[PDB]
Amino acid sequence: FVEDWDLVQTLGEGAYGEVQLAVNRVTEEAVAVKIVNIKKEICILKMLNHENVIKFYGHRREGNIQYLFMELASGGSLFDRIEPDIGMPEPDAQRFFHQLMAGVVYLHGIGITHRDIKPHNLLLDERDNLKIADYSLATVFRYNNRERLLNKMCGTLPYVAPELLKRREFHAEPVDVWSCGIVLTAMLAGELPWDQPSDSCQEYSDWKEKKTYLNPWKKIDSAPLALLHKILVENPSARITIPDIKKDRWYNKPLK
Numbered sequence: 228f229v230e231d232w233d234l235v236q237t238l239g240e241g242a243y244g245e246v247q248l249a250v251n252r253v254t255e256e257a258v259a260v261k262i263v264n265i266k267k268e269i270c271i272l273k274m275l276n277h278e279n280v281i282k283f284y285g286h287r288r289e290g291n292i293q294y295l296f297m298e299l300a301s302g303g304s305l306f307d308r309i310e311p312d313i314g315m316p317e318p319d320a321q322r323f324f325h326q327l328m329a330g331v332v333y334l335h336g337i338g339i340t341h342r343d344i345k346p347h348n349l350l351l352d353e354r355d356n357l358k359i360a361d362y363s364l365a366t367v368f369r370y371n372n373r374e375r376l377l378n379k380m381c382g383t384l385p386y387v388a389p390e391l392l393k394r395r396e397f398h399a400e401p402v403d404v405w406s407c408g409i410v411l412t413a414m415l416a417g418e419l420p421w422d423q424p425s426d427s428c429q430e431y432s433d434w435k436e437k438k439t440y441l442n443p444w445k446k447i448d449s450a451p452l453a454l455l456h457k458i459l460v461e462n463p464s465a466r467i468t469i470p471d472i473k474k475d476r477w478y479n480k481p482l483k
């Protein structure tokens with residue numbers, strides 16, 4: 228197989244391309260290889276250098292098929308650690324949310340929006356450290372210290388922020404904060420609050436009308452629910468920013 232590496236087993240079968248575990252036969256060094264505006268993805272990946280972000284190793288073409296060498300995460304995905312209808316222990320949820328925020332802070336710091344944060348894209352290494360993966364929807368929202376608004380609609384409807392359904396153009400960062408809130412709900416409740424944040428979705432209307440006696444909100448302790456109250460605000464300008472999330476009571480609660 229490709230140069231020094233053997234493509235042993237498949238780990239992803241998506242609409243982009245597939246992801247294989249590449250064990251080098253020499254050193255035994257094991258990595259992840261993805262097989263295939265992919266020029267766009269590559270140079271975003273070369274930018275990435277943070278412990279809560281999938282490290283890029285390098286690219287290789289073979290006529291028709293491109294090969295992306297990235298840090299392996301042998302722990303699978305966060306999705307796999309969420310029990311349906313239950314979620315996970317609140318302390319594990321807090322640790323993952325800490326690592327997730329660190330990751331999103333980094334990306335935003337280098338002027339990058341991921342645009343498709345959800346548990347399927349949050350992989351774990353062997354010591355259960357979270358890594359933000361899949362920069363195939365990722366784009367630059369800040370360059371030479373000037374922000375550009377987004378207008379491409381993308382991501383996954385249950386994770387997606389309301390402004391993306393309604394506004395012609397919108398700020399990148401509140402969109403990623405929003406989806407982080409949906410991920411936090413899923414970790415604490417083991418279900419997603421709504422199919423879409425649209426005025427035509429009952430469960431979303433129920434949330435705007437603060438009916439937290441309904442699921443999934445009633446499975447969630449008052450401390451994190453208060454943070455979810457600040458994160459899932461429909462007006463992107465009133466929605467909490469990451470610096471202010473970092474000051475939240477539950478974010479700063481000791482748990483084991």
Ligand SMILES: Cn1c(NCc2ccccc2F)c(C#N)c2c(N)ncnc21
Nearest residue numbers: 238239246259298299300347348360361
């Ligand atoms: C299982 N697995 C991946 N799945 C691909 C994938 C799944 C979902 C969304 C996007 C996407 F690309 C990886 C990747 N990237 C991956 C990895 N880097 N290290 C270990 N295991 C991995």
